[PDB]
Amino acid sequence: TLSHLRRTNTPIGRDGKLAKPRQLHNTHWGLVCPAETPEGQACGLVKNL
Amino acid sequence: KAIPKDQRATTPYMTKYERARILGTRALQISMNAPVFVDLEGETDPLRIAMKELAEKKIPLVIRRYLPDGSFEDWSVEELIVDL
Amino acid sequence: ASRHGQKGTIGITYRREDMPFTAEGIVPDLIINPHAIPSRMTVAHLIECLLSKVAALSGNEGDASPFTDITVEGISKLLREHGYQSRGFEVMYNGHTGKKLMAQIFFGPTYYQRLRHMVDDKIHARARGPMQVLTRQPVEGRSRDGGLRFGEMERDCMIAHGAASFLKERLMEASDAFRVHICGICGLMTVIAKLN
Amino acid sequence: SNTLFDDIFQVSEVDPGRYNKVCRIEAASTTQDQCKLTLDINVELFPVAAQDSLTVTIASSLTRSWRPPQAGDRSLADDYDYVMYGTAYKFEEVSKDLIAVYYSFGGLLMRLEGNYRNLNNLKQENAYLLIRR
Amino acid sequence: RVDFSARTVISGDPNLELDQVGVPKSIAKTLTYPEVVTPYNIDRLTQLVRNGPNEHPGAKYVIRDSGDRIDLRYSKRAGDIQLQYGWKVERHIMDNDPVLFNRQPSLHKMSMMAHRVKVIPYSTFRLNLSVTSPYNADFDGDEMNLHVPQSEETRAELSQLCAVPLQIVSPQSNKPCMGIVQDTLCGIRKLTLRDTFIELDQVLNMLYWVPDWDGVIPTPAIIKPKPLWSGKQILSVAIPNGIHLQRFDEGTTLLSPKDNGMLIIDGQIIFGVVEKKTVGSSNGGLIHVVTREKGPQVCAKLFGNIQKVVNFWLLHNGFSTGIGDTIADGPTMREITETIAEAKKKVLDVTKEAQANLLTAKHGMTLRESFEDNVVRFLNEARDKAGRLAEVNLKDLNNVKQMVMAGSKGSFINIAQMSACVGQQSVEGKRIAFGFVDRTLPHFSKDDYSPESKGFVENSYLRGLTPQEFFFHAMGGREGLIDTAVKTAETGYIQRRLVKALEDIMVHYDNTT
Amino acid sequence: EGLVEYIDAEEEESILIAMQPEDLEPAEADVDPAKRIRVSHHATTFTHCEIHPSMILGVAASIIPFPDHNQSPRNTYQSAMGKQAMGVFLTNYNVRMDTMANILYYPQKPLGTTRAMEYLKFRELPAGQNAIVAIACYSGY
Amino acid sequence: LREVFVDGEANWPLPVNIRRIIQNAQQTFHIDHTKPSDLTIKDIVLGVKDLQENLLVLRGKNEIIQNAQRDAVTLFCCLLRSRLAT
Amino acid sequence: MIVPVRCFSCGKVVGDKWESYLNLLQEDELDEGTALSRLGLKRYCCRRMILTHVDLIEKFLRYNP
Amino acid sequence: EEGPQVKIREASKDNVDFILSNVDLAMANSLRRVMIAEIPTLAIDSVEVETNTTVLADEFIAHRLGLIPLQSMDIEQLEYSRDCFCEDHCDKCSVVLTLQAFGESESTTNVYSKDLVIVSNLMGRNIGHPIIQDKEGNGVLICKLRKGQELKLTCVAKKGIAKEHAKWGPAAAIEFEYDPWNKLKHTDYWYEQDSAKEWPQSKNCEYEDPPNEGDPFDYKAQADTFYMNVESVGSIPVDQVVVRGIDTLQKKVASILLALTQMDQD
Amino acid sequence: MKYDRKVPSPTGEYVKEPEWVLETDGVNLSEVMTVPGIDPTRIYTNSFIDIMEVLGIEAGRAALYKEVYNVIASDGSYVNYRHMAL
Amino acid sequence: MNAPDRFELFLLGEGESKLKIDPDTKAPNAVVITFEKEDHTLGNLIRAELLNDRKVLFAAYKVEHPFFARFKLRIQTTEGYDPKDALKNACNSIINKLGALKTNFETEWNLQTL
Ligand SMILES: [Mg+2]
């Protein structure tokens, strides 16, 4: 329940296919979680803090 | 267009697809309450019966093989060599 | 499933008699296949075991927090101060016969979770039933007592096999199928068929 | 109803290649300096130490299921201590006038070398091996 | 969508035949095969009718020539009824009916194979392990489908064409597409070894387990004081007669000291340890032979035997896995530590030797580009090799190694990354980049090109990563999980087009195409 | 009392940070052959220090025991299932009228834990059961 | 061959495994590597020649086809003769 | 949510030792591991049975009708 | 005396540490299994719920009750409900219990198994008594409750055995062991440097003489002596669980000889 | 680049007789072909689209098939000629 | 759902003898007894003791599948000695043993204190 309260959605309509953002950036360290992310479909777009 | 028993060209063997349809086709007929030209050594399964009807090559059927151009070659199950 | 993406289902239930046992007397609540370890390399599952098989003995809530100063070498030290194999392995006898097992096995407590999606919430069969109105084909879901989709892919597959008719079937005699009257002239669904 | 080979060999060495229960043994004869021997052996039911005096025999007898004991009072060409039974898979020619045959007992293999069993050694499966002392 | 279709969770049954599919009763009682009332059946048929549509072996509709249904679950004259030649009786699916089993997605001839029905308790479709890969399914809650034939000719197209055993050799790789896995495999080896001897009592039960056992207790490999049998010996009982197979791995010499390769004569293992190569989906493997030598039939029937025999012996020899299989000889740990450190300087050297502009550009283009290619190549070289140490120090009694040897599961890599050292992570090739203006994590000093920052995990999965290691590692893995989210998008489309392009292409009767 | 600050991503660029408050501070004047291998403290500029690393995680993972002992992807899946598991989603369930809901007859607080749980109120509302497990090939089921 | 498989590559996908077909022929008659054969050298060569005459893939009664036959057969025989060498 | 009667694994009874256990703590001020051995729970299978369990029930009761 | 003798070691009211000698493994285990899931016992096998205002839901409690160990020394004389011609349970094949509780105390009311009341005729025979071994004397806390939380139940004990559901078995755990100094090599000890040290030594070792290196391998050796320890839930004195076991089994082997005869006539 | 070509030794054996070669990075076959020094017999552009316009369809195919075979073969994925072929 | 009723693990149904004896054609003088509603608890035991009858040439059992409590048993013996009789002996032999055990046990138990 908590988990669903700390979730993020990244609206990349159109640019869904890139060596993109779905990537785990460095700036992300500490603010977002490294592992907790959905497989396929809309991966790395949605992040849990 | 029709092809004489001679001038025959196709395989002398039976395509699995041929056999399987025959077998199926026959069994179907058997279970349709059709005459069975062999001694049921106590078989109650139309397939099984058909399979026998086949290993004794006593199946009244003729495969008509059609050729891209329309003409066909007719082959009987009596002839067709069943290896597989 | 455990907490290391080690999801699995049940494949059968046994009883203390059939289950393998340890001289101590104990027996397993659950049996996972070792082949679910190498290629997946989930050592934490493997480690949770050893840790817990100890905390359960000392009654000291074993800490398995991320980056810390805890060792496998250091847990085995505790666990042996308790009498059992320093590695967690234990001797075990075959339930059926009762003869020792040539090998030894990894035996221990391991928090597992029971996640939704239970078989009976899925089993689902049909053979003729409700029929979509417009289409006149089976209907969707099991809840509405519907049927199953025999899609392009399962189609291409039959064609591949050569199963000419098992196909015609799935498509006619097993779904749509309908009879109609055509005109031998204007090839249409015109014709007024008063079937009496 | 015969015998097929007799001699005594001396172990040149014993090799337990990661095999806690079996060791392959090679030994030379005490007659012709041509007869050499290579043979796997169960070192748990019949230990063997380097340099020993072993007796080797063969023969094809004393093929219908195998009968357990009972014969506690029957035939027993078992005046030995180790007695296996297997098959031969090849008859090789180690150049010149030297022929060697290979054997196998459900896993255990055997290699022999010489030349006077031209009419002695058969080419059939049957063949019991023996060893004593 | 279609009628006469079913779907549930599936599981593994080391007791069914390859071609079988354990259907749960629940379904059998719901799916009906319309049979035709005929003198051959009338007796047995009416029997069902009577049996009602609730007892298993039963039926649930009867139909007269007048084209009208008889709802056997109601219709006052339920118990009544005298069947008739030419009538039909939609009956319950019974053991041995031919069915079209399958898992999605379907892009393989081997994604839909016919099977011998086998009504069973509990609600899960049951299949044989060795027919797992053709469907490419796991029992992690994998739903499979099932379609039931309807005519006699239809069920014949499934029997004579789409039948699991008929599918053992794959046309798109001219080789077997079904093997022998996990337990069975991992065990058939432990059972084979020269060091594996079985005594009477057991030797028998095994013999028995094999359904075609000519009922001839085979003369013991050993007799001397205590009569024993070799694993190879009885397993051989599973191998028909007329089988011949020569192998020769590496040091193989018709006396294979390492018990390499393998000889099988007149269906009897003469020598050599059995495993993946011998009993897997390999080309000239045991299966490939049997199928081509004896017949599709004989083959399928072969898996069974092996499985049963083996599985049984395994059940009693037992097999496990645990942390103990990941910890290596104390010294081999240090020996690794330093083998890592030494590989750090061999880097550091090339570090200053490039900070002092003494680095040959190299055909490798760009000095910097040419720098990396040396560093990486230096650390990898260390991992692979850091492991080559543990891999050889793990005794022949280490479960993990055993699963690897038998090849049931695992690669030596998996050994390294667990007991020796993980390795250098990566993103598009170029080790961990600088998202953090001239560095990796704010826990680092600007312009640090050392390995511990460009993303090199020095610890083994056993010791456990560090904040930094852990984090990079992540970025690294999370990659696949992406080129899978996009690949998946275009993959599909390709797959279809090809297919939609070559539909109509079939070998005609003139042998043209 | 200025003893801790809120540093975002941007202002994170221009700073240095210590992992551990201890290990990464004292002087260098032996080392466990079992532990892992952490680099060093080659710097004396540390603007800030990390409370505890674990905090880089999210709800999900926070529950995984020893996530620092598994192939990164394993933890990525496990953090997608603890969502499909069962437990005690509250304690007023016997008074709630929500469509669907699942409760475990006998919950059990895990034997293997993460200090991080303490704030996730887990020991107070578990989601599994410490099952006695044996990794063995048995029936082949 | 060298004009086809320039690479030099000798291993190829071909019907009829002849390596085995013989291994069977071997221990199926318990042949012994001691005593001499009994084959007329006419036997071998003149037979292996008749063999190919029957590995028919196409059948036609005319040239065009009976020519395409010799083709679809080629790459094989070469393996054949390669193996059934006097 | 109420102690469990008997330990899933081996079966020995258990549901009574609750208050007895929860007592050797608050009153006899002891350390869990020792309390259990004192309640006859020798093996971890049962041992764990108690040590773990969370009496949510108590929190349930605190409700109303 | 004649064959399979015994030397009971430690032994009490709930445990039976004993050295069963001169027998066959097979048998040793057979018995074990029997003692586990084939010794008949009684337990609640049905619950008629009149009124429940507790937090726990019906079946939940229902379930609990089943487990509640019940007396059953005189179980051998109380026919299996599926035989007591009576349509659906006679006094001749089933005890019947009751449970009623009310939230009187303005402070949590514990409902134990002692609160169980037998209502049918015992016909004078130890049976259906909620077993108790508690110190205070109120064994098995069946459920708790607040203010006006009511609970009215109707329990119907019956025969049945673990095989048919665990709530029956009077076993609870059985120790088993032999060849403590692995002399038959029925196991290959997994190690790292030296099994001996790494692999703990069981207390049972003393009761059998150690190895003695040099000595070859004893291949004719088989398995006598089995260090067993039968624990009990209480529904039967430990001892019987051992005896009644040795019996049920004994009885089974008979039904085969018996069945063979009922088959020799035709 | 120094490629390792295998070729007929005078003695018969097949051996590695390395050769230097140029790999473009833009493409205009039509003319890089008519340049002296190159073997306009072994030239090749991964762009079969061209190798078709220049060299002629049949060769095009050859390239096509060749290109395809590779794509699939970098995964180490065998696929019996016939298919891709078709 | 599809779960069979627990009691089918020891309660024979309509028309099913604990025993069913079939002649094995593979070998001479051998039989296959199908013990319904039984399992290892018994099978293995009979099997084991059945092995001491020196007049017995073959004895092995097997649970054809876990879902079904029932097992097969095969017996073979020295021509002139019907198996069934060998089967009995085994059983009896078994009983006598147990009997003694029952006995000898009690004895030791009564001599105990606590
Ligand atoms: Mg999947």
Ligand SMILES: [Zn+2]
């Ligand atoms: Zn018209």
Ligand SMILES: [Zn+2]
């Ligand atoms: Zn317990």
Ligand SMILES: [Zn+2]
């Ligand atoms: Zn009654």
